[model samples]
Target chain A: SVQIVYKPVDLSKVTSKCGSLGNIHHKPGGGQVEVKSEKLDFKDRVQSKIGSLDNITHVPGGGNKKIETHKLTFR
Target chain B: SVQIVYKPVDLSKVTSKCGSLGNIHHKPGGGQVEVKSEKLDFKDRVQSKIGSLDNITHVPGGGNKKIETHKLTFR
Candidate 1:
């Protein structure tokens, strides 16, 4: 079992090229979230692709009007 | 603003090739898990790499003795 702390970025901040992956929960307080998973593959895929250390962004209503910062880690 | 259901596989059951991405919380009840993220990049990366719709597995103590099934969905 590992724990990861993640902060999300607004969708608008991202470039036109993005991945339509899927769903997740946002930690309401201070905008930081923690997630734990037993699967190594999950961990691997995230670290490998996002490993570039670029800022992650979120968009709402199919628009970039709303944006925020996100962070991630595993233990 | 989306919900995703993911069931993780045992590390042992997967092929030698796997992703070391990172952490997550396993739903205590019956092995199925759901996660929500505000970051679209996270979703996009996962769907793109693992999008092959392959079986996800988890391993313990660096051994394949333990294996399990995992499911995933985004809404």
Candidate 2:
């Protein structure tokens, strides 16, 4: 099982946190991260419920703002 | 096909629950991660229709917001 972490942060600042691990994915309605790839565990992400990410805002020139983040787990 | 469920939560608390999920994406006026990712599976959709985000607020000392959320499905 893989543990997925969803933490909201400055998208620009993402490099600072998870570094290169900080990735981007489509967040559709409900709890699913949209896509079909090996990146976001895209295979399993298919039809999976992605916990929502919110408090979204711009950092203005990419500084900082409430961000969207999550962690997924499979057992 | 998959089921997506969008829910709200304090980005700060996500770690306590999901243990470091919650990632940060760009809200460049809409959904879609910038910088591109081999992880995002940036094909097919070309411009994947991600969900919308709204109703944001600060956590005060920390906590609570109605939030922006969504879900996705494909079969």
Candidate 3:
């Protein structure tokens, strides 16, 4: 299983970018969301789904609003 | 900035796949490692560096030894 945490970005945009990657769960009170995937190829799937990290922007306008920070873990 | 955590896999293999993604740091007691990047395009760089999560394996032999679990966080 894997969990991807995205924050400070438009949830709708994030959800739109997520294509069959996993189940999308909105965090309570907004401002955050998670995508949980039990698939064996989670990383491969996510890489294809997101395409580029530059795609997920902090602002609504689709510019080069890169993420401030990111973290990844494997267990 | 970002930090990626990998475990239960050969640290050398992980480091080899890192490919300029970040500074690879080995844990004191072994069995785990971390990659820290302060680059603005950390996510983009990492995606290209790793290529596919399936590339990082648990055993030394070249085979499809997929990762058991993974987690990603943005801050």
Candidate 4:
């Protein structure tokens, strides 16, 4: 099976580019959240969710220099 | 960022090839467990954990023909 891990973005470092934080919550312990799916659509959903934030720069190989979210995929 | 999703194995279809079921618990709703880690070590740990089961065949292209675990990776 495959597993994906996404590093939680630090809210303090993000701008209100996409508007309000809304339902997203930042944990003090900084634990990453795990989303599981058996299909590739999982990636689309995650990308869409992150894209909706639009707080951190999502350019390829370019973005906020100091603050960045980490992504890890295992198959 | 990368994300990986692993399909939970059906316990009923697996044999105790490695040992007892032990600490693993099967949920009634059959939801997959999510483990979040920012490092590749997450893969290693998961592999080791699954390897310890050794109930399902781990051949490169062969295994129990009737059952298989699904793995998905997103970047």
Question: What is the RMSD, in Å, between candidate 1 and the native fold over all Cα?
Answer: 29.7
* Better candidate number, 2 or 3, judged by TM-score: 2
**CAPRI class of candidate 3:** incorrect
Alpha carbon lDDT of each predicted model: 0.27, 0.33, 0.25, 0.25
Candidate 3, A42: how far from true, in Å? 6.9
Lowest lDDT sum, 10 consecutive residues, model 4 chain B, at: B50-59
Q: Any runs in candidate 1 off by more than 4 Å, and if so which?
A: A1-29, A42-75, B1-75
Scored by lDDT, model 4 comes in at 0.25
Residues A18-47 of candidate 1: C-alpha lDDT, one tens digit per residue: 223234332212222234344333332443
Which of the numbered candidates is closest to the native, going by highest DockQ?
2
Q: Which candidate, 1 or 3, would have the higher lDDT against the true structure?
A: 1
What DockQ does every candidate get?
0.02, 0.06, 0.02, 0.03
- Best first by TM-score, ranked: 2, 4, 1, 3
Clashing pairs in 4: A2-B5, A2-B6, A2-B71, A3-B4, A3-B5, A4-B3, A4-B4, A71-B1, A71-B2
As for candidate 4, its interface RMSD to one decimal place is 29.3
Better of 2 and 4 by DockQ: 2
**Model 2 ranges with Cα > 4 A deviation:** A1-34, A37-52, A55-75, B1-49, B52-55, B59-75
Instruction: For each candidate, give its TM-score against the true structure.
Output: 0.13, 0.14, 0.12, 0.14
- Residue B40 lDDT (model 1): 35
